[PDB]
Structure 1
């Protein structure tokens, strides 16, 4: 269904729901679902996350018990943005080292045309990252 967030940090609140969807695709190991953000404003995500192709799973039951829940386009991961941030420009040198690093340089004028971020983590390790999602 189309989930309504009715209190609100939707950006950080919509991002936990995918962590269930991250873990539920390892118990059964499917990828037969689709992801759709209808109210993709140019500021926020909007209080409508929807799964298209959950409602009885362990995370969403306790979310629904309290007084706040009701339970074309291309939403693709874009990890080319992740190398634009300059902690990854030096990871990328140690990749390509395998020589003069000093003849490599920066860009000094970049213009990133409306990316959008949702912060998450790993569960094998203790390591964080970003789910960069555009149209």
Structure 2
């Protein structure tokens, strides 16, 4: 019983991650005035490089789906024609069911991330005795990573520049009602919820 409003980026030359991140920031601004976790991300044109020009907001209700797509940002990028919002059409039966998963394992591979991890492990080694050597914690020599298309997100309450980094993968077309999260989802601590693309 899922509907979709795909917003395509028209202006012919633009960064897609810079828009996708902003779209998820405004989704994240919502779901706090209306404490809900119902709405997905649905990147339909996710290729290996430059995630495609449009993003939908697949959900069940279709009353919140269109509540959040009128929040004076999506509307303000409509008169100046950089967005093209759809008319909330239903998902067909036999679709491709993908899953956009925030990993967060990639954030703790960065040298800062490793340092942060070792510093925490140093703090909660208060199971006291040997002050374990930070000498015996070396980055291996080589890490083969894929694929994770990192989006330029940032914190509101603190002025910190983070980076949610998200992976596409497709199987098992049914679980939950819905589940999702703050920034849309296919991971958060409970679910591997698919998305009908």
Q: Measure the CA separation in 2 of the matches of 1:118 and 1:126.
A: 17
User: Which of structures 1 and 2 has the bigger CA Rg?
Assistant: 2
- Report how many aligned residue pairs link the two structures: 135
**1:84-112 CA deviation, whole Å, 9 max, x = no partner?**
11111001111101311101111210000
- Partner residue, 1:6: 10
- Partner residue, 2:163: 130
From the two aligned structures, give the one with the greater helix fraction: 1
In 2 relative to 1, CA 106–57 (structure 1 residues): closer, same or farther, beyond 3 Å?
A: same
**Runs (5+) with no aligned partner, structure 2:** 60-67, 86-96, 124-131, 169-197
Q: Which runs of 4+ in 1 moved over 6 A?
A: none
Question: TM-score by structure 1 length?
Answer: 0.95
**1:51-84 CA deviation, whole Å, 9 max, x = no partner?**
0003321211110011332112110111000011
From the two aligned structures, give the one with the greater strand fraction: 1
CA contact (8 A) 2:74 2:83 kept: no
Question: TM-score by structure 2 length?
Answer: 0.66
- Structure having greater relative contact order (Cα 8 Å, sep ≥ 6): 2
Across the aligned residues of Structure 1 and Structure 2, the Cα RMSD in angstroms comes to 1.0
**Runs (5+) with no aligned partner, structure 1:** none
1:50 deviation in Å?
0.7
